[PDB]
Design a protein around this ligand. Structure first.
Ligand code: CL
Ligand code: CL
Ligand code: CL
Ligand code: CL
Lengths: 505, 514
C-alpha cells in the first residue's frame, strides 16, 4: 500500500493479462524491454500506436527532419499570424484526394490536436449548417404565415377547419392558430441535434457519458436494409399555413433533425471491418435524403495504411467532410485535420475554433515531411503497403485455415488487419472461461505472445474478441514468419485448453 | 480568385487588422518576420503562445533535451504497457502542490493532448461521481418505498400530499407515479456551473478565435447544460444556484402516517473556476469569490474543478495559481508550458480519495505519449531548479511589468480603465470606443475589433507583438517569458504611450489601415 500517483489499477490489470512490461527504446518495427540482467530484449510491434506508425517507431528521416526543425528555431507558437504551411498541407491533401477519387472537389482545412478534436470541428460545422437550414425554413414559414393571414383577414381565402387538428390545442381564430404554430415550431427548434453513427464506432464526444454529448442514433453496419426504417422514425415536422389558390390549410414541413452522418471506412471497434458497397450506398442515400453532411472519420486508420492515402477513396465512400490524425504526426508529434468541401464551408467557422496548440509550427513541418515521404517515387509507398498487406493477410489466412476451431475470420485491408477469435465463454479450462466471461481473452492471448514469442499484439473489438495486426510498411518476411510460428503456438495452446500456460497465476 | 485551401478569411481579417505577418524564426522573447528584402525584422512577443512560453521560444535546454530524447529512440507509442514517467510526473506535481498549499493531499494523474481534453476528463470523472451519488440516493428511496408499502398493507394511513406526484391514492399507484417522476429527474443531463470559464465559454461557442460574445451560444445543444455564474458578483451566485435545486420523491413513514416528500437530487456534476480568467481579461479570483466556491462545493457535494490549463505553470509567481489565491479544489487541470513550447501535453489531477479507477483504463492514441512525457520532466526540473529561483524571477519580472502598465494607465486613464492579473499574466482594459469621433475607429469598435487594430499599430510602428482578449477585444494581454529585459519593458512603455496618445487624439488615419 505505498503511495502511487498514476496507473496503479492500469498497471495491476496489465500485469494480470501478462502485458506488464516497460519498453525503453524503439526503432522500426521493434520495441525493447530490459531483462533481469538489464539487456535490451527486442519485441516485434504489430500494434504500432494502433496503426499510427506506418513508417515505424522513430523513422530516421522523421527524426532528422524534427531535429532540423528545432535547430531552425521554427515558430511553434505563432497564433493569430500568417502560417502558410496550413494552406500547403491542405493543398497536398486536396491533390491526393483528387487523384484517388478522380473528383475535382476542393476542401478547406481546419487543424486540431487529436482525432476527437477534428471530429468535434465537424460536429460544430455540421450544426452551423443545420442552423442555416432552420433559418431558411423559418423565414419561408414566416412569409407563408403573412400571405395566409392577409388572405384570411380579407375576401381572398377560406381557412379549412379540417386542417386545424394538425396544430391541436384549442384555437380556431387566425391569430390563435398562428400563435400555436409559432409555439409548436419554437419547441422543435429548441430540440438537440441528432448525429447518425454506426455500431462499433465512436467519434470524439459521440459515445455512462451519453449525458455529456448530443444524441446519437447507432445504426447497424451489418444490416444496411434495416437502416432506412430506423432513420424514418426520427422524422419530425414544423407547421405552417399554406395558401393554395382560395384555401389556407395547416401543413407539415420536414424539420432538419439530423446534423450529420459519421462513418469510419475501417471500424477498429468492429474488429477492422471495412464499409461494404451496400452500406456505402445506404449512407449516400441518407446524406442525399437528409441534406446533412456525410462525415468520413479516418482519424483511427493511419494515412496510407489501407493501401490508399484515403480508405474512403478505396471503398468508394463519397463524403462531404473528412478527418485525419493517425500517422500525420510521424509517430513523434500530435496533429489532426478536418477537411470540409468548400461549396458547403461556412466562412465564419475559420474564426470559431479556438485551440492554443492547434496549427503549431512544429507538427505542421513534420506533416509536410510525412506527406513528402508517403508521396515519394510516384506513390511506391502505397504499392509497398499493398504488397506487405497481401503477404501479412495470406499468413493470417493460412493460420485461420489450420485453426478454424478458435479463429473465425480474417478482417481488414492493406496493413490494417485482424483475426476474429471464436467465443471461449463455454471453455473447458476454468482460467480461460473466466477471462472470456469478463471480456479479457484477447488480452491474455496477447500476454502469451509477449512472454513466449516476444511479439507485441493488442486486441480490438467488443470483449477483446479480435487480434490487431497493423505494423509499419517495413515489416520483413522473417518478421511475418516469426508471427505465424507465434500464432500456431498460441492457437494450439488454446485448442488444447491449456489454462495453466495461457493465464498467469 | 486563385484556389485557396486554408485560412483565406483568417488571412484577409489579419491583413485588415495590421497583423498580416509571417514569423519565420523565434528565440527567447523575439519572433522574426522578413522585410521586402527578405532580412529578419525582430519583434518583441508579449503573447508568447498566450502564456505557454514561460521559458520563451525554443529554449536551448528544452531544444537540447528534445533532440537527445529523439536521438535515444524514446518510445512515443507504448499504449497498454507500463509507462512509469506518468507516475513520476504526477509525483512531482503532487510534491509541488503539497509545498505551495501546505496540504499533504494526493492526486491521481490522467494525461491528454490539450487543455480542453484535460477539462473534459474532469467533466467525465465528475459525472461518474454524480452517478454514484444518484445510485446511493435511489438505494435509500427503494428501502423507504419498501418500508412504506409493508406498513400501508398493514397498520398505517397515507396523508393528503399525493399532489407532489395526485390521483387515486392507492399504494401501488402512488409508488408507480414516484418511480415515473424519479425516472424523469434521473434521465436529465448533468448541470455544470462555471465562473465565466474559458472552457465552457469555448464549448458553447461564446469564446471564438477572434471574438468573445457571451450572448452568442450556438453550440449549447452539443454539450451538457452549463450555468455561467457572475465571478464579479459572488453575492448573486447563491440565489442563481438555489434556483437550480430539483427534488426526487419518496414515501416517509412517521408512526401511522406515510407522506410523499421531496429529497434533494444531485443536479450539479461540478463547479469550474480559473484562478486567472483570460477570457475576462486576466482577472484573478478574489478571496470573497474563493469563499463562495468553497461554500457551494461543501453545499452541493460536487467537485470544485480548478482549470489552470490557460495560465501556464509558474506564470502567476507560484506553480499553481490556485495555491497563490487559496482556492481549495478537488480536481486541477494543467496544459500551457508543460510542453516546453514545442510539444502538446495536458494533465487532470483528481484527489485520490474521490478517484474512480475505471477513469484511467482508452481515451486517445496520442495521450500519455513518451516524447511529451520526457519534455514535461525536463520543464518540471527547470521550473523547480535552485530552490524555486524561477518563481522568484517571475514575481520580480511581473512586478516590473505591472508597475510599467500601472504608470501608463495613470497617464492614459481617458482610454485605459484598469490593470488586471498577477505575475507575468497581465492585461490593460481599454474603455469602449463605440462612441469614437474618428469614423474608422468607431466602425472597428462596432465590429468588436478595437484591440486587434491597436495590436496592429504596436506591430507596424513599434515592432511589438500584443494580442487582445475578452469581449469586443477590450483588453491587451502581456504574458512574456521570465527572460523579458528592463529595456524590452521600456520599449513596450514607449510603444503604449505612443499608442494611447494616438487613440486619445482619435487618429483613425494612423491607427486603422485603409
Ligand atoms: Cl522510456
Ligand atoms: Cl502520428
Ligand atoms: Cl518538407
Ligand atoms: Cl507548452
Amino acid at each position: 500500500g505505498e503511495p502511487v500517483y498514476a496507473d496503479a489499477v492500469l498497471n495491476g490489470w496489465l500485469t494480470s493479462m501478462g502485458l506488464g512490461v516497460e519498453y525503453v527504446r524503439a526503432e522500426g518495427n521493434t520495441v525493447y524491454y530490459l531483462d533481469d540482467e538489464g539487456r535490451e530484449v527486442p519485441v516485434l510491434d504489430h500494434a504500432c500506436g494502433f496503426g499510427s506508425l506506418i513508417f515505424g517507431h522513430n523513422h530516421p528521416e522523421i527524426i532528422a527532419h524534427a531535429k532540423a526543425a528545432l535547430d531552425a528555431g521554427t515558430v511553434v507558437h505563432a497564433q493569430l499570424s500568417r502560417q502558410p504551411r496550413a494552406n500547403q498541407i491542405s493543398r497536398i491533401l486536396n491533390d491526393i484526394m483528387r487523384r484517388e477519387t478522380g473528383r475535382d472537389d476542393r476542401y478547406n482545412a481546419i487543424f486540431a490536436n487529436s482525432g476527437a478534436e477534428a471530429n468535434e470541428i465537424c460536429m460544430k460545422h455540421a450544426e452551423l449548417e443545420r442552423q442555416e437550414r432552420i433559418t431558411a425554413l423559418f423565414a419561408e414559414i414566416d412569409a407563408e404565415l403573412d400571405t395566409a393571414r392577409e388572405a384570411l383577414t380579407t375576401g381572398t381565402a377560406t381557412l379549412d377547419t379540417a386542417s386545424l387538428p394538425l396544430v391541436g390545442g384549442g384555437a380556431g381564430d387566425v391569430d390563435g392558430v398562428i400563435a400555436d404554430i409559432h409555439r409548436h415550431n419554437d419547441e422543435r427548434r429548441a430540440e438537440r441535434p441528432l448525429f447518425l453513427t454506426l455500431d462499433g464506432s465512436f467519434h470524439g464526444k459521440l459515445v455512462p457519458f451519453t449525458a455529456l454529448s448530443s444524441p446519437a442514433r447507432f445504426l447497424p453496419a451489418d444490416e444496411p436494409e434495416l437502416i432506412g426504417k430506423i432513420v424514418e422514425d426520427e422524422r419530425r415536422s414544423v407547421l405552417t399555413l399554406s395558401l393554395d389558390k382560395d384555401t389556407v390549410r395547416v401543413v407539415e414541413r420536414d424539420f432538419p433533425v439530423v446534423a450529420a452522418i459519421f462513418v469510419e471506412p475501417v471500424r477498429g471497434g468492429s474488429g477492422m471491418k471495412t464499409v461494404t458497397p451496400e452500406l456505402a450506398e445506404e449512407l449516400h442515400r441518407l446524406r442525399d435524403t437528409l441534406g446533412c453532411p456525410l462525415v468520413v472519420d479516418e482519424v483511427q486508420t493511419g494515412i496510407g495504411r489501407t493501401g490508399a492515402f484515403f480508405g474512403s477513396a478505396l471503398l468508394g465512400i463519397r463524403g462531404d467532410y473528412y478527418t485525419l490524425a493517425k500517422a500525420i504526426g510521424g509517430g513523434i508529434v500530435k496533429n489532426s485535420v478536418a477537411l470540409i468541401r468548400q461549396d458547403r464551408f461556412l466562412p465564419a467557422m475559420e474564426v470559431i475554433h479556438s485551440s492554443t496548440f492547434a496549427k503549431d509550427g512544429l507538427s505542421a513541418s513534420i506533416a509536410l515531411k510525412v506527406l513528402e515521404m508517403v508521396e515519394a517515387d510516384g506513390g511506391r509507398v502505397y504499392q509497398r503497403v499493398r504488397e506487405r498487406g497481401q503477404r501479412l493477410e495470406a499468413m493470417l489466412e493460412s493460420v485461420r485455415a489450420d485453426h478454424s476451431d478458435v479463429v473465425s475470420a480474417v478482417w481488414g485491408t492493406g496493413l490494417m488487419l485482424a483475426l476474429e477469435l471464436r467465443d471461449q465463454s463455454n471453455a473447458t479450462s476454468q482460467a480461460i472461461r473466466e477471462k472470456a466471461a469478463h471480456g479479457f481473452l484477447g488480452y491474455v492471448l496477447a500476454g502469451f505472445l509477449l512472454r513466449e514469442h516476444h511479439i507485441r499484439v493488442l486486441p480490438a473489438g467488443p470483449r477483446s474478441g479480435f487480434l490487431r495486426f497493423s505494423p509499419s510498411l517495413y515489416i520483413t518476411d522473417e518478421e511475418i514468419d516469426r508471427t505465424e510460428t507465434a500464432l500456431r503456438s498460441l492457437f494450439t495452446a488454446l485448442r488444447d485448453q491449456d489454462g495453466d500456460r495461457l493465464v498467469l497465476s
